Symmetry: D2
């Protein structure tokens, strides 16, 4: 396991703010977005198609434990949380990424917003991918990938074990 | 072929306005509704969950042809069009029901709003079912049925060969 | 004070279901609708422009008191409440009509959905208007009238003391 | 007239892409946003409340005329256009900023999206303010200012002669 690095080569700091930006793409960062109409909670996660939109920042925290370091390592379980002062819907749910485990979850389940910090579906690992400062995210339900989503076909995050669907990302420090 | 009858026993007249109401249901009539987020045209068709809502009016017209008669007969191809002065979106498409034949069409294709009068996918038949006063609609892609749709699970219309999904309806003359 | 009558001449029953339908109009009954974008709660009340839409039913209950009668009388304070099994937004607020008394209320304040049963802003009286089975509604902030609202200019309910803005209605028993 | 300068001291070039960002603000750049519900075209312009969102790019072009120079000068009439491949609504109107001159225009009219290049209401000037690198925009209806708008109070652009409402901005060169 190695220090995960941001897009400028510096190791990623626990609790600090990063945009997640899909490598080698015309569109922008990852953002919350409704994936169902009504009810529209929990929200899904999509890549915006808009080129200079950087994403909504997130920060990473270890779970469990790791009373050692202010730095994020690969292959080690974290929670991923959106960081926003404003959050005008879905307020009874958290901002933690989580894999949909509801009774309507799809065979490749959507990644939603609203996990509980300790529940197994909220745990991710960051792993090295082939590509400088390029990574992938995994979960116990599969690797994070995409399919075309409901907003003009923008990529929507799901968990999948189809290798051709993996989402490759880099982490861009919020400055 | 028999004369199709409205919910008061009278023959259904070509060009007059009817609500299409699902038989044996605590919900209301059939209404346009978005089935996709963006783009949201073409519109789909959904049964409203609200009990007192009668649906949006439609009318029926022979296609092709038929100049013998004022009435609508079973087993005979017609167009079905919503009738509404107010139509604030998807103005580039008609108000004619049609089966989705677009490149993204599901295996059980949605019934969408926007057909061309002579197009094959715009032709329906009315057929008798058991009782009442009760009918079904058929197209060359299958019988009109429903699945749970994006508006709190409200039934959404589709063309299907699954007999368990048949939507049984009555036609309520508009005042 | 007199028994208020429905559109079919029968006195109005406490707790029973009625559509409120503006007299002498091309459009339909009164319905909840968002009057602001975000936040969209509390909901406003508009007249739908769609001709055969009857409104969302309401029922009237005395407040205070009146331990006497199953019948609604003029000039006597009631609450007005929307009656719907389904209510998919604004759930932390009631379905009682009320006059907006928030810090952003307009000089002619909107009628909103969400009053508290005993608060003074949730109290209405039904009064006779010139017209058979025609009434108006009043509140301590003024008579219920309309202005053009945000949905294609559909009439939105407000409280006003401008006599030219009064909304004249009839009560149509839900059958 | 002076050469207008971007937030890095370089002269602003006609036709190149800039974000317009409000000076001294915890919110982001300027973006199209619906200001009316239905119809929702034309779009208005709002400052986003989200801190890391840079706004949607614009570019500037002389109108009329001026073929001496590549750069944008103060005190000189230009068009301002949003620049975006993705434009999923209001396609019947341009991406040009304009002052609302429609029959429903407020006393301090909204700045809307959809002007005609030669139309008077589509002409702006850039003027210096105090520091930085800081400017304002003016039109023949007044200076561009803001009021709290329909998206959680986010500032919405309008033309005004109220000096207390002046929006002070910098121009951030798009990468
Ligand atoms: C429900 C709540 C949400 C959506 C519907 C939606 C939804 C979305 C969508 C609109 C976009 C991501 C997809 C995309 O790239 O779109 C690209 C941009 C467009 C397609 C053009 C503008 C779309 C407008 C804003 C929506 C019009 C609503 C239509 C008319 C309603 C149709 C309803 C039918 C059922 C009839 C988006 C984005 C987006 N969202 Mg979103 N998002 C949310 C929720 C949140 C939310 C709580 C947050 C934290 C403040 C949040 C953040 C956020 C950020 C930072 C960003 C982006 O940069 C965005 O990519 C962006 O482009 O915004 C313009 N979102 N969020
Ligand atoms: C886009 C355009 C459309 C929808 C999104 C939509 C959509 C819909 C839906 C709302 C309903 C059918 C489903 C139902 O039973 O719901 C029942 C009632 C509700 C679910 C509660 C009210 C929902 C409100 C009105 C909309 C809120 C939208 C949310 C906040 C957007 C968030 C989106 C996320 C992605 C962020 C409906 C109906 C409905 N429609 Mg619809 N419909 C259209 C389009 C039309 C249209 C052109 C017409 C001809 C005038 C038209 C008519 C029409 C009629 C007559 C009726 C009904 O009686 C309805 O069943 C009804 O209950 O209206 C309240 N519609 N139409
Ligand atoms: C937020 C929640 C709501 C709206 C936005 C909205 C809103 C509304 C509106 C849509 C209509 C009343 C005004 C009217 O006559 O419209 C007439 C019909 C149209 C203009 C065409 C269809 C409009 C579609 C459904 C909405 C598209 C959403 C657009 C694309 C979003 C634009 C967002 C911008 C910011 C970018 C309406 C009606 C309406 N509502 Mg509404 N209503 C609600 C809320 C409720 C609600 C909780 C209930 C109890 C189930 C409820 C009931 C209800 C009933 C029974 C009825 C009607 O009969 C309605 O008049 C009707 O025509 O529905 C189609 N509504 N409700
Ligand atoms: C209709 C079309 C539009 C809106 C409703 C709307 C609307 C808006 C709003 C949402 C924001 C600006 C205000 C803001 O800061 O909000 C900040 C973030 C939020 C308030 C949370 C997310 C709200 C979600 C995305 C929409 C939910 C709609 C509700 C559920 C509808 C209920 C309606 C009731 C009547 C029933 C916004 C932005 C926004 N827009 Mg917008 N915008 C448009 C149109 C466009 C448009 C054509 C473009 C060119 C691609 C476009 C771009 C654009 C960009 C780049 C950005 C931003 O960065 C934004 O500030 C942003 O934060 O996006 C999330 N927009 N655009």
């Amino acid at each position: 396991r190695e220090q995960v690095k941001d897009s400028n080569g510096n190791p990623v700091k626990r609790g600090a703010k990063y945009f997640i930006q899909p490598a080698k793409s015309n569109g922008g960062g990852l953002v919350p977005a409704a994936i169902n109409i009504l009810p529209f909670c929990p929200l899904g996660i999509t890549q915006t198609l808009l080129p200079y939109q950087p994403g909504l920042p997130v920060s990473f925290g270890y779970e469990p434990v790791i009373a050692g370091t202010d730095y994020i390592y690969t292959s080690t379980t974290i929670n991923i949380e959106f960081r926003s002062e404003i959050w005008p819907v879905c307020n009874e749910l958290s901002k933690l990424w989580a894999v949909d485990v509801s009774s309507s979850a799809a065979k490749e389940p959507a990644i939603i917003i609203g996990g509980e910090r300790t529940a197994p579906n909220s745990l991710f690992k960051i792993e090295e991918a082939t590509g400088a400062h390029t990574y992938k995210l995994t979960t116990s339900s599969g690797t994070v990938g995409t399919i075309p989503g409901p907003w003009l076909g923008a990529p929507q995050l799901i968990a999948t074990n189809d290798d051709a669907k993996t989402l490759f990302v880099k982490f861009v420090k919020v400055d």
